[PDB]
Amino acid sequence: THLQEKNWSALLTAVVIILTIAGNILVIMAVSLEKKLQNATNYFLMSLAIADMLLGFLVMPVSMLTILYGYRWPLPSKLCAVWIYLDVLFSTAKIWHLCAISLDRYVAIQNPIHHSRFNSRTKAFLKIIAVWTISVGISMPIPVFGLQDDSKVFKEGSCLLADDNFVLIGSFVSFFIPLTIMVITYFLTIKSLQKEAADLEDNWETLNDNLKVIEKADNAAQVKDALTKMRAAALDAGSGSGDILVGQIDDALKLANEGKVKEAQAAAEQLKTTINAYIQKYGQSISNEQKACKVLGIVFFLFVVMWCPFFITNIMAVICKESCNEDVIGALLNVFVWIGYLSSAVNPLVYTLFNKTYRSAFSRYIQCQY
Ligand SMILES: CC(C)CCC[C@@H](C)[C@H]1CC[C@H]2[C@@H]3CC=C4C[C@@H](O)CC[C@]4(C)[C@H]3CC[C@]12C
Ligand SMILES: CN(C)CCOC1=Cc2ccccc2Sc2ccc(Cl)cc21
Numbered sequence: 494t495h496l497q498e499k500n501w502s503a504l505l506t507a508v509v510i511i512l513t514i515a516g517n518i519l520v521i522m523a524v525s526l527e528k529k530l531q532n533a534t535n536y537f538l539m540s541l542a543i544a545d546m547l548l549g550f551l552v553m554p555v556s557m558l559t560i561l562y563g564y565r566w567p568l569p570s571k572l573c574a575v576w577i578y579l580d581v582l583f584s585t586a587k588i589w590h591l592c593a594i595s596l597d598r599y600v601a602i603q604n605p606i607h608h609s610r611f612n613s614r615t616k617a618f619l620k621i622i623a624v625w626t627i628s629v630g631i632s633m634p635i636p637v638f639g640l641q642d643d644s645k646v647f648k649e650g651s652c653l654l655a656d657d658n659f660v661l662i663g664s665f666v667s668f669f670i671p672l673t674i675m676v677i678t679y680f681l682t683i684k685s686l687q688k689e690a691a692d693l694e695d696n697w698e699t700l701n702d703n704l705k706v707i708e709k710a711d712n713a714a715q716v717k718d719a720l721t722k723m724r725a726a727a728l729d730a731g732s733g734s735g736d737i738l739v740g741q742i743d744d745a746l747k748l749a750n751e752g753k754v755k756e757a758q759a760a761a762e763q764l765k766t767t768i769n770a771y772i773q774k775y776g777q778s779i780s781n782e783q784k785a786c787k788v789l790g791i792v793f794f795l796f797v798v799m800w801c802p803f804f805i806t807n808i809m810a811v812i813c814k815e816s817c818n819e820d821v822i823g824a825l826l827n828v829f830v831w832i833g834y835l836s837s838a839v840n841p842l843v844y845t846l847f848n849k850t851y852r853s854a855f856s857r858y859i860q861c862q863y
């Protein structure tokens with residue numbers, strides 16, 4: 494029965510490993526091939542996928558091997574610190590990539606021309622490298638104090654974080670703080686997007702009012718005034734996209750400057766439909782931003798929820814070092830770490846479920862259609 498349980502646990506963990514590897518390889522392929530997904534957010538998501546693939550290649554199979562050997566470290570003792578370091582490094586890179594995505598998208602939408610078509614690809618790669626560097630800096634104390642002292646990474650022959658200060662500082666620096674920052678940034682982001690939609694409605698109101706004023710105008714001065722208001726409104730409502738709409742308003746304005754009232758009014762009549770179409774397009778862009786915000790919130794929520802039992806049990810075990818049952822806590826950790834690895838695997842499934850570009854790319858990759 495003991496062998497039965499360890500063999501089925503190892504098999505389930507192997508299923509989790511293969512799902513992780515396949516899904517994250519597919520995500521890497523989709524981001525590197527599909528030209529629609531060439532923004533900074535998808536670059537960060539591919540970095541996340543690479544981190545998950547490294548976690549499934551370097552950490553999860555060694556964890557399965559540890560399971561097979563009754564949780565006694567089979568490899569040399571110096572490799573336990575390296576294993577814990579790689580695990581912590583990849584998980585910290587994941588969580589801080591999510592936090593960086595949140596902050597970056599928020600600060601981005603805080604920019605009046607952030608619907609422009611000029612987004613720098615190189616800067617995203619630089620930010621990703623900086624996040625990897627700060628993750629390495631966060632994780633380095635674990636090898637530092639683990640290669641010197643074997644007691645902080647070993648507990649009765651098993652390989653796991655044993656230092657209480659290590660567990661506390663790690664749980665705060667790599668889990669709690671980014672979680673709080675992400676929650677706050679998420680709510681601030683929904684507020685900014687609401688403000689964006691409100692301003693868009695305001696610009697549409699201005700465009701409609703002045704269109705009617707143009708429809709019933711006597712002289713060129715009235716037409717020019719209404720067109721000036723319209724131009725400012727349309728420029729603000731483009732939010733940086735760079736449209737023909739302001740140029741067409743400038744054409745009408747030029748007509749009005751020449752004292753040609755009837756022709757300016759005809760130009761405005763033409764402008765009505767163009768204005769409606771472009772306003773609808775701008776609101777669609779805002780809605781797309783909202784949908785991306787919700788999808789990334791789903792991803793962050795899944796990661797946090799699926800890792801929370803492990804961190805809760807770890808903090809609890811550090812609090813009641815001898816008051817609580819350590820065997821049951823050991824089993825709880827041995828299950829919750831794999832729950833967190835399942836979180837590491839789940840993300841490509843979400844990308845498929847809620848992103849049509851990813852879904853079509855994956856459907857074509859499964860059938861080897863490149
Ligand atoms: C193309 C873009 C989006 C993805 C780039 C991924 C790069 C920057 C990431 C993915 C895997 C990362 C590596 C993962 C493991 C290690 C070993 C560690 O001891 C030092 C950091 C180092 C070497 C990381 C450096 C940064 C790294 C190479
Ligand atoms: C050997 N393996 C099990 C270590 C993995 O534990 C951790 C995972 C993580 C998961 C998700 C985000 C961040 C981490 S950073 C971390 C920090 C402190 C401790 Cl105590 C654990 C810990």
Ligand SMILES: [Zn+2]
Nearest residue numbers: 602689779782
């Ligand atoms: Zn926007």
